[PDB]
């Protein structure tokens, strides 16, 4: 054929996907900012990756949550941790639902919506949570009746699932007194 | 509950993995257990045959 192939010098054979030399290598050495979020650092080095997890990020964010004294400042942090996928906890649920139920102007509707959404993300409801929900269901006489009964039905469901789960937990240990107490509370 | 269906996070509820109680148990499949004669023969064969390759094939 030819000693220098057409592909090299002929513009008909120009390859549009090739890029110039300087661009890729400039783009490559870029180290983007490690603090992309509040609460954490994005791992950079393999060593840093061994310190990292979504499930532990839960812990750090829970702390940062217990810190905020007002619901509004908490909501932001929560939105973040929801968005960057962070495994969410019983504890995220406890510290959210408490400070939503104390916050004076909350529509009870949204407290329950929020609970529901936390559970959709796979937080395991527990006694504290259910009980707080219960307290919110008492302080609302202002809602439609069917709403109150819907949420009461869901709450009873919840307390029963809890009681079962907790019997299974305590039974193999021959805990009888303690188990009996927990049942007394349920 | 099979050990994979048990919920071990005190703070979460995770979706049960799709292989949890499903994969069944045949000693023919696993765990790997085998005769020594056959193992020897296998290993040696595999060394002796490194160069029997037809590269150029249709």
């Amino acid at each position: 054929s030819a000693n220098i192939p057409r592909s090299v010098w002929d513009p008909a054979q120009h390859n549009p996907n090739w890029s110039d030399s300087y661009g890729h290598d400039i783009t490559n050495r870029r180290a983007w900012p490690a603090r992309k979020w509040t609460v954490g650092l994005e791992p950079c080095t393999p060593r840093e990756w061994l310190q990292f997890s979504h499930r532990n990020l839960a812990y750090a964010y829970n702390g940062a949550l217990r810190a905020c004294h007002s619901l509004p400042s908490m909501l932001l942090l929560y939105k973040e941790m929801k968005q960057r996928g962070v495994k969410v906890d019983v504890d995220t649920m406890n510290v959210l639902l408490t400070r939503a139920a104390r916050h004076e102007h909350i529509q009870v509707d949204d407290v329950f919506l929020l609970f529901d959404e936390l559970v959709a993300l796979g937080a395991r409801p527990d006694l504290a949570a259910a009980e707080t929900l219960h307290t919110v269901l008492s302080h609302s006489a202002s809602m439609p009746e069917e709403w109150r009964e819907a949420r009461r039905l869901q709450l009873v469901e919840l307390y029963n699932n809890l009681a079962m789960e907790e019997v299974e937990r305590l039974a193999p240990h021959r805990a009888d007194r303690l188990l009996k107490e927990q049942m007394k509370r349920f | 509950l099979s050990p994979l269906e048990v919920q071990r996070d005190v703070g979460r509820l995770e979706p049960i993995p799709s292989y949890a109680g499903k994969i069944n148990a045949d000693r023919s499949v696993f765990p790997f257990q085998w005769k020594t004669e056959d193992w020897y023969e296998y290993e040696v064969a595999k060394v002796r045959n490194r160069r029997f390759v037809f590269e150029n094939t249709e």
Partner: peptide, 14 residues
């Protein structure tokens, strides 16, 4: 106590 405490701190350690 915090579910975190009972996940990570409920084991024997130094």
């Amino acid at each position: 106590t915090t579910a975190e405490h009972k996940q990570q701190d409920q084991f024997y350690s130094p």
